[PDB]
Amino acid sequence: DPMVSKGEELFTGVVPILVELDGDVNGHKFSVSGEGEGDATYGKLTLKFICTTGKLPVPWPTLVTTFLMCFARYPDHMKQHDFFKSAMPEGYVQERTIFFKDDGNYKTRAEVKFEGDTLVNRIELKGIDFKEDGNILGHKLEYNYNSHNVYIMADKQKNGIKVNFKIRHNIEDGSVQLADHYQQNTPIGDGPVLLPDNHYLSYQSALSKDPNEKRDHMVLLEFVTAAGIT
């Protein structure tokens, strides 16, 4: 399929990634930069993020979803369902509202696209109605992350997709903080895209710290595999 070929050819090896985030949660301003690489053949991404404005005013885990679905490993039998690659290199817009149960909400807008050989994810995040002493502004979330399926459907009237999913962040008392994600992606370009049948992406995320790093940061290792169209 010369279409599957175009996106294929962009992701076949190891692709450098750059991430930039401008954040404001309850007027706590911040900026994050990330660098790493993805190898979609293996569904694999390796990233390191730095708060370049000093202390991050929210827990790092809360940002993981916001900080690259074009790097999902879509099995051969499913390559006709990979919207994300199909929009490249022009890219796509990924918008979310993330509702933290009994707390605030993030609203994010990202543009994911190639700048030359580099895959770039430029994000703006606005957080409002947070409790200054809740789980998020009070930094009560554990530095870890659970595995999760993410459900993708077509949004044919918007030439895009809709993604809907829940993340449960572990709180240090042993309870969980639900973060209910609503998501929409739409291609940046005017060209054809692959609009998928319902399927899901399976995510595993491991968070760690660079022992030589003094700044406030997060090392993220993610594996993402499409499924659910057997």
Swiss-Prot record:
Expression by tissue: Photocytes.
InterPro entries reported for this sequence: GFP, GFP-related, Green_fluorescent_prot
Outcome after substituting residue 167 to T: In P11; increases fluorescence at 475 nm excitation and at warmer temperatures such as 37 degrees Celsius. In Esmerald; leads to brighter fluorescence. In VisGreen; leads to brighter fluorescence
GO biological process terms held by the UniProt record: bioluminescence; generation of precursor metabolites and energy
Superkingdom classification of source: Eukaryota
Effect of substituting residue 145 to F: In Sapphire/H9-40; exhibits a huge Stoke's shift, with an excitation peak at 399 nm and an emission peak at 511 nm. In Azurite; shifts the excitation and emission spectra to shorter wavelengths and increases quantum yields compared to BFP
Effect of residue 202 to F: In H9; increases fluorescence at 395 nm excitation
Effect on the protein of changing residue 80 to R: In Azurite; shifts the excitation and emission spectra to shorter wavelengths and increases quantum yields compared to BFP
UniProt-listed SUPFAM superfamilies: GFP-like
The keyword Protein transport appears for this protein: no
Pfam name, any one: GFP
Result for mutant: residue 162 to Q: In R10-3; matures to the red-emitting state with excitation and emission maxima at 555 and 585 nm, respectively
Biotechnological exploitation: Green fluorescent protein has been engineered to produce a vast number of variously colored mutants, fusion proteins, and biosensors. Further generation of mutants led to more stable proteins (at 37 degrees Celsius for example) with brighter fluorescence and longer fluorescence lifetimes.
Substitution effect: residue 146 to I: In ECFP; leads to cyan fluorescence, folds faster and more efficiently at 37 degrees Celsius and has superior solubility and brightness
Outcome of mutating residue 99 to S: In alphaGFP/cycle 3 GFP; improves folding at 37 degrees Celsius, reduces aggregation at high concentrations, and increases the diffusibility of the protein inside cells
The record's account of how the chain is modified after translation: Contains a chromophore consisting of modified amino acid residues. Maturation of the chromophore requires nothing other than molecular oxygen.
Result, substituting residue 198 to I: In mut2.1; shifts fluorescence lifetime from 3.03 to 2.50 ns
Known outcome of mutating residue 67 to M: In RSGFP4; increases fluorescence and shifts the major exitation peak to 489-490 nm
Outcome, altering residue 198 to S: In EBFP1.2; shifts the excitation and emission spectra to shorter wavelengths and increases quantum yields compared to BFP
Variant or mutagenesis effect after changing residue 193 to A: In mut1.5; shifts fluorescence lifetime from 3.03 to 2.72 ns
Family: Belongs to the GFP family.
Subunit structure: Monomer.
General function of this protein: Energy-transfer acceptor. Its role is to transduce the blue chemiluminescence of the protein aequorin into green fluorescent light by energy transfer. Fluoresces in vivo upon receiving energy from the Ca(2+)-activated photoprotein aequorin.
Protein known as: Green fluorescent protein
Source organism (scientific name): Aequorea victoria
